[PDB]
Design a binder for this molecule. Structure first.
Ligand SMILES: OCc1cccc(NCc2cncc(Br)c2)c1
Length: 93
């Protein structure tokens, strides 16, 4: 049974103008800006950028990897695929 997203969960995250992108739910550091209601800090693998997104844009990784895991030409995407498959919980900062 699924649960609400928690830090460490692996997803594909969708933003307008980009393919569904390999990403993880991040933690919020002490005193850092918190997401709006029902949004989460999304760390994008490959590009190593963070956005606040809601669950409607978050696709759990295992269920969605067959559909969204194909390499493409977008900058950072293939490295993102490598990171989520090979070391998704490492420090990339
Ligand atoms: O719209 C706010 C916002 C926040 C972070 C990054 C971007 N664009 C670039 C980008 C980088 N990695 C994955 C994707 Br998917 C997109 C936009």
């Amino acid at each position: 049974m699924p649960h609400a997203f928690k830090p460490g969960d692996l997803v594909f995250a969708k933003m307008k103008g980009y393919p569904h992108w390999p990403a993880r739910i991040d933690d919020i550091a002490d005193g850092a800006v918190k997401p709006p209601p029902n949004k989460y800090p999304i760390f994008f693998f490959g590009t190593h950028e963070t956005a606040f997104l809601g669950p409607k844009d978050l696709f759990p990784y295992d269920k969605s990897k067959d559909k969204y895991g194909k390499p493409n030409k977008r900058k950072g995407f293939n490295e993102g695929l490598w990171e989520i498959q090979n070391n998704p919980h490492a420090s990339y900062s």
